Amino acid sequence: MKLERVTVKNFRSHSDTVVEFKEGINLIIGQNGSGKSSLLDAILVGLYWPLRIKDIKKDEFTKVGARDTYIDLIFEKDGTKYRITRRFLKGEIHAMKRLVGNEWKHVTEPSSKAISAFMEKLIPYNIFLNAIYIRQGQIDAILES
């Protein structure tokens, strides 16, 4: 599995963030409050929604600042390039596509349910958390004695 690009709009401090990942060690530096932490939560939402991540589903009380929360993630697994795009209307819109030729094509019905079922088969959530992503505090937890 390899990440290529994450675009995050209107999620916590990310107003319009784009991060391009490349081969090798990609160091993302920043001080607490920077948005580096929420960038990882956005990748998790991108791949694994629905899951419990706050500030994704929000209510609107004014048009000021009113914007959809949008997360677009492009990644690759076993030679196929995938793109999951999610939009949360402050209703939801979800699409997962694979690059076929020069066109992005739906891998399943564009719904949260269908895409979640497909992802659990492509790269299950447990493989992501237990084998790929070492969350903050996990190194400490392992050494508990």
Binding site: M1, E20, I25, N26, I29, A131, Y133, I139
Partner: protein
């Protein structure tokens, strides 16, 4: 079968931890203290409590065990994402992490390491800085 699992995870973690410690520790022993995984290390032929590890050795052990679990569950390590792997401004752990970045992590196809530590820049292949500016996160591709 449980013991078979434990012995296997131990073997995988032992090789990585031995590499991270330049052979100082020959083995990581994995036991299940009433279904709650506990680790021990072997030094000069004796199993020792984790309190004997230096701070750098603790981060090496935690990382080795995670890498061992990736191999155990997925059979390989193609992508590793680490969020703040060391405590805030821990110097000893910084130095060990740099050594691990240079000698082992650089061989994984892709690693995404999120950290507050500016001193890790030279050991990375690409550096992106994210900072809060005028209330919004701003991305600066450094390299």
């Amino acid at each position: 079968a449980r013991e078979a699992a434990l012995s296997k995870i131990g073997e995988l973690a032992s090789e990585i931890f031995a590499e991270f410690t330049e052979g100082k520790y020959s083995e990581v022993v994995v036991r299940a203290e009433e279904n709650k995984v506990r680790l021990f290390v072997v030094w000069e032929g004796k199993e020792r409590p984790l309190t004997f590890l230096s701070g750098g050795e603790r981060i090496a052990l935690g990382l080795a065990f995670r890498l061992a679990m990736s191999l155990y569950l997925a059979g390989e390590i193609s992508l590793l994402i680490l969020d703040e792997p060391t405590p805030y401004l821990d110097e000893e752990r910084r130095r060990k992490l740099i050594t691990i970045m240079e000698r082992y992590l650089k061989k994984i196809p892709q690693v995404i390491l999120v950290s507050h530590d500016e001193e890790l820049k030279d050991a990375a292949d690409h550096v992106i800085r994210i900072s809060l500016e005028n209330g919004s996160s701003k991305v600066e591709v450094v390299s």
